[model samples]
Target chain A: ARQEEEMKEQLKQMDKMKEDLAKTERIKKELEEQNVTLLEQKNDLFGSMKQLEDKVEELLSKNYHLENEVARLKKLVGER
Target chain B: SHMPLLSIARQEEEMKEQLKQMDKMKEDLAKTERIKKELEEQNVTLLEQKNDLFGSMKQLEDKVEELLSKNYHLENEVARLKKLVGE
Candidate 1:
């Protein structure tokens, strides 16, 4: 009788453990999915950042031309 | 109603089964814990990456604004010069 009681108690504990493990596994799966999403976001941000950098380069070149034009005009006026 | 020897053997087998099951559960718990730790570490790295990207973007935004302002002033200067030259 005592052994049977002990087994019953242990069975209940095992059931609890099973439930906890299932919950943890579910959480782990969700976290894994979230990590995948985060990685994708990081990649997308990288692509956007690269495009922004390219725009900055284009703006820099345009400004360089504008500076030269301004200098040439100033020289023309000064000589006259 | 009682055969003591057979009852004892049955109880022993049931006990062994429970032990085996508990062992498996413990192993699963250990493995799950390890994965959770790795995931947390990855999360930290990702957050740092995001912060670095944000800082770069902010600096670039400032640089773009400064360059645009310079372009606007240069255009105004060119207009003033052209008017003085009577063209």
Candidate 2:
């Protein structure tokens, strides 16, 4: 009976170790998935930011042309 | 008897859940990116409108000034004609 008790305790310990390992593995997998999600989100944000910057540049150039047009019109008005 | 198989099955289910979560996150990210792009486009459109409005305002100012100057010249010509007719 004493030997049986020792063997049963060992089996229990082994089962506990297995359960802990499974939990740890599941947590690791979840973390990996989260990391991937974060990476994709970051990429999307950066892409949009780049597009916004391009648009701003385009608008600024348009503003410059409009300013030039205004200047030309002002000059014509003055002459008249 | 089938404890190991049960654990494996649970693990598989958890993995599937994780995958689903990841998919939802990816969709959310895509939506956020799309919204950001739209906002940027709107900003550009607004900027273009502002420039157009300013251009129109400038043209209107020029037109108004030209009309005023022409009116002044016409008034002067009318006065000169009247004085000559009187003489």
Best by TM-score: 1
Runs in model 2 lying further than 4 Å from the true structure: B1-87
Off by over 4 Å in 1: B1-10, B79-87
Which residue pairs in candidate 1 have backbone atoms (N, alpha carbon, C) closer than 3 angstroms, thus clashing?
Answer: none
Taking all chains together, each candidate's TM-score versus the true structure is 0.79, 0.44
**TM-score of model 2 vs. true structure:** 0.44
Among all windows of 10 consecutive residues in model 2 chain A, the one with the lowest summed lDDT is A71-80
For candidate 2, the docking band is: incorrect
Best candidate according to DockQ: 1
Candidate 2 per-residue lDDT, tens place, B1-87, comes to 335556556656655655565566556555555555555565556556555555655565555555556555655544554454442
On residues A14-55, what C-alpha lDDT tens digit does candidate 1 reach at each position?
A: 998999889889888888987888788788778878877987
Error of 2 at A80 (Å): 13
- TM-score (0 to 1) of chain B for each candidate: 0.77, 0.56
State residue B11's C-alpha deviation in candidate 2, in Å.
32
